[PDB]
Structure formats: structure tokens, C-alpha cells
Amino acid sequence: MFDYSAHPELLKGRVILVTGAARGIGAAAARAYAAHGASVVLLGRTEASLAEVSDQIKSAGQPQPLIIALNLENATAQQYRELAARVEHEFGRLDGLLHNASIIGPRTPLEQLPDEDFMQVMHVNVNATFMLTRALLPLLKRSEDASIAFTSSSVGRKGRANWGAYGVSKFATEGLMQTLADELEGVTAVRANSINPGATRTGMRAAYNPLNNPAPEDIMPVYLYLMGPDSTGINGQALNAQ
Amino acid sequence: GMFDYSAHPELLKGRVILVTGAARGIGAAAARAYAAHGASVVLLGRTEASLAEVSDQIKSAGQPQPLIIALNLENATAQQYRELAARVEHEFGRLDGLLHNASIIGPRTPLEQLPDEDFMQVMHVNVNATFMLTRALLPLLKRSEDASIAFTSSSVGRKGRANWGAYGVSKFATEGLMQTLADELEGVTAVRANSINPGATRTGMRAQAYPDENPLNNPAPEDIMPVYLYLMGPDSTGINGQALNAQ
Ligand SMILES: [Cl-]
Ligand code: NA
Ligand code: NA
Ligand code: NA
Ligand code: NA
Numbered sequence A: 001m002f003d004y005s006a007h008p009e010l011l012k013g014r015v016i017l018v019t020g021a022a023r024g025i026g027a028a029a030a031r032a033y034a035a036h037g038a039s040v041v042l043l044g045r046t047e048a049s050l051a052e053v054s055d056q057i058k059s060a061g062q063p064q065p066l067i068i069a070l071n072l073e074n075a076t077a078q079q080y081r082e083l084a085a086r087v088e089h090e091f092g093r094l095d096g097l098l099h100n101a102s103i104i105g106p107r108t109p110l111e112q113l114p115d116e117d118f119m120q121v122m123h124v125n126v127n128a129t130f131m132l133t134r135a136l137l138p139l140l141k142r143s144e145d146a147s148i149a150f151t152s153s154s155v156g157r158k159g160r161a162n163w164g165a166y167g168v169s170k171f172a173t174e175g176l177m178q179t180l181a182d183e184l185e186g187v188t189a190v191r192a193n194s195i196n197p198g199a200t201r202t203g204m205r206a207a208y209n210p211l212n213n214p215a216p217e218d219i220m221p222v223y224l225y226l227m228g229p230d231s232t233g234i235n236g237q238a239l240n241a242q
Numbered sequence B: 001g002m003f004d005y006s007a008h009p010e011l012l013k014g015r016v017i018l019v020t021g022a023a024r025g026i027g028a029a030a031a032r033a034y035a036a037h038g039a040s041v042v043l044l045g046r047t048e049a050s051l052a053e054v055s056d057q058i059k060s061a062g063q064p065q066p067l068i069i070a071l072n073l074e075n076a077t078a079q080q081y082r083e084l085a086a087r088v089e090h091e092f093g094r095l096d097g098l099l100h101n102a103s104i105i106g107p108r109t110p111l112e113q114l115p116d117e118d119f120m121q122v123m124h125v126n127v128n129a130t131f132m133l134t135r136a137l138l139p140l141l142k143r144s145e146d147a148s149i150a151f152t153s154s155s156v157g158r159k160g161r162a163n164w165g166a167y168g169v170s171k172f173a174t175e176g177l178m179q180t181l182a183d184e185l186e187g188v189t190a191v192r193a194n195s196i197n198p199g200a201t202r203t204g205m206r207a208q209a210y211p212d213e214n215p216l217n218n219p220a221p222e223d224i225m226p227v228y229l230y231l232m233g234p235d236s237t238g239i240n241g242q243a244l245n246a247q
Helices: A024-035 A047-059 A077-091 A115-142 A164-184 A216-227 B025-036 B048-060 B078-092 B116-141 B165-185 B204-209 B226-232
Strands: A015-019 A039-044 A066-069 A096-099 A146-151 A190-196 A238-240 B016-020 B040-045 B067-070 B097-100 B147-152 B191-197 B243-245
Touching (some): A015 A024, A015 A077, A024 A039, A024 A096, A024 A216, A115 A146, A146 A216, A164 B116, A190 A216, B016 B025, B016 B078, B025 B226, B067 B078, B097 B116, B097 B226, B116 B147, B116 B165, B165 B191, B191 B226, B226 B243
Parallel strands (some): B016 B040, B040 B067, B147 B191
């Protein structure tokens, strides 16, 4: 487990956007970020899907998170632009971006993976991720201390049979993070890094018993770390949660 | 250093090898080298006129008439890839080698300024098309006694660098694709999959990527062929999943 304990006000005055916030790891990140003082912006397919996590953040005592609905599989460049303008309109600032959303697609050998499935996984996991980062980079580059975290996987770092487009999309994600990190270095106050969450007790991981994995809630040290002031200067890193 | 392999003039006798982006540069050099080492070559490129020179060169060296296939990577669908495979199957009944050489660079701007559609088109051409072509040809490659797929990569597909736009990203995906497929092919087929970083060459694509570099600094693509020949011939049987360098 990554070793870091966050102060209850670690992220105060910071605005952080989380994609895939409805369930699983994204949901735990939205909650933990809100619990540590950050104003959180939640991305998901429908308001309905973000209602429970939002009710949780509100029950805990934080103001209604900003909810933005987007179909990552469909969303156009213009939609990401409109999303960024919403964050600008509300906050004038973005300090954090957690790229958590992605789909696995079929787990079949490449020879059997339909072309349309390969394309859709690449679009959701890579294209949408790029378009979202591009739209938000002006806002992040205004911040005094901003952080971008991409989610990867062991199969994004060493290719394994029957992971279809998922492993390939996670390689692409690492290459995107490394490219971005090299552009940000020194000349901006933005950092870019990847997080391998490892095995978690989520619907998504239950892929690959389940009792052997921690709750996503419990893999939050590295997530809190990258979004707060203690990771200033840490850039271009592929890190592990566990 | 230059990959250490010398290829005997009949090294590739008995082999049918498809080369993408065959019209010029590294693709043309590989097509010419494979034919010169005894292979039957299938030339893939955008237009007949673009492929005439390389086809003519191969015929004249006496090697003889290669198969020419036209395809538009930005908009070819499974129908086009299926028909390509059917043509290869009709003529040869198999494929012994597949050199994925075609790719595009896109803009080399910072990511912040990289237009969305340019990013997606680079990803489509360099990755989606490479996958669909691979998938259409795998059954043919599997009919070979000893088959080899080589993906083209780049130093920036292995360690990311500023202002490579979608190009570095696409080559990271390429290495991912190669590794995944190698793991699926290993021990249960006679097909290997590896990647090649060609390094710097004296081509129009290198000049596009480095607008201020003088091409005189770079070797001719025909001089970087040792790894290209190695991977396609029997001396590389059992080499699978590896990220190799031409230079
Ligand atoms: Cl050229
Ligand atoms: Na929810
Ligand atoms: Na199709
Ligand atoms: Na383009
Ligand atoms: Na196909």
C-alpha cells in the first residue's frame, strides 16, 4: 500500500474533477477528495447515476458537487469545450483532474475481437481522455499548483493475452501521460502522472478471491497524494496504489 | 548500433510477405529488400501510381511482378480489409510475413493545441487500421509454417517526449498491441510478433517530423534493413514479443 496520510483540509481551496465517479474507484475518489476540502466536479453518463455519490458527499457535510453529464462514447470536441466553460464559469480555476473512467470491452483474443469493439474501447479510453485533457488544460495552467492523474493497469505496462483493446488503450494512456508530463515540465505548475490502482474490491475488478482486495476507499493514499501540495514537482511518474 | 544480421540472397525463398506503406521510404526499401532476398511481395499503398516505381524496380531486378493492393487507411472498413485478405488467400493460400510500416505523424504541436480530429485520425490510421488489417490477415498468417508480423514503432513509443502529438501515443498503443498479440500467439501458433524502432532515416516522413533537420544527417532507408530481414526469415523463429531497434 502507498504510504501517505492526508490532513483533513489537505485539498481545501482546490477544485478537482473526477471522471467515472458514479461507482467503484472514481466514487471513492470523489468522496475522499470532498472529505479533504476539495470542491469536486463529477462526470458520468447521467445525473441519475451520480445522485447516490453526490448524496454521500452531501451527507458528509460538503456542498452539492458540480455534476456534469457526458457520454464519453459519443461526446464531441464542442461538448468538452462546453464542459470546461462550465468549470471556468463556476470556479475560474481547475486544480485537479482524475481520469478514472474507462471500459474494458470484450476479453477475447485479438483475432476474435470485433473491429467496432476495439475502436470503441480506444475511443472511450484514449480519445475521450485526450479531448477532456485538452479542453481543461487552459484552466489547469492557470492554477498555482495543478495535478493530472491518468488511470493505468499492469496490462497497460506489460501486454497480456485476452485483454483485447483494454491493455492496448492503457499503453496509449501511459504514452499520453509521458508526452504531457514532458510538455508540462518546468514551464508550467501542472504535473501529470499515472496511477495503477491495482486489485480493488469493485464490480469492474470482479475482469479476473474478491476478499483479497482492499475497498477502493482503502487505496486512496496515492490519489490524495497526487492532488495535494506534497506531490508538487512529481511529474511523469507511473505509480502504484496497491 | 546497426542490427547485427547478414541475409543470404535466398533467405526469404518460399515466403509471401505483405508490406504496408510500400510506395516510398522504409516501406519501399523493405519491399525491395524482401524481393531481392527471394520473397513474393504484396505491396500495399494508397494508389496504383504511387506503387509503380517500387513494383517496376522489383520486376526489373528480375524478381518478378509483385501484387499491388490499393487501400485508404483513414476510411477502409472491415469490408476493405476482408477483401484484401481474400485476394491474398486466392493468390497464395497463406501469408508468411506482415510488415506494418504505414503510419502518419499528425501535427507536432503541444497537446493543449493539438486539434481533436487530428489526434483521432492519427490514432485511427496508426492503431485502428493496424489492428483491423492484422485481424483480417491472421488466419492467412496461421496457415504458414513460419510466419512473422513486425510492427513499426519509435523511441517515442517506448519513452514519451514533448510535442509528439498523437504520434508517440499511437506508438505506445502499437507496442501494447504487439505485446498482447505476441502473448496470444506464443506456443499455440507458428506466428511471431515483434516491433521495430527504425531510428533516423533519409525519408520524407523523417523530414516532416523534424522540419529543421537536414536529411543528409540520416542514413538511407535501404541501409537499415538487417533487422527487417532478420524478423522475416527463419533465423528469427522463436523470437516473439520483442521491441527491437534497426540502429
Ligand atoms: Cl520518402
Ligand atoms: Na452515483
Ligand atoms: Na465491421
Ligand atoms: Na491529421
Ligand atoms: Na478487420
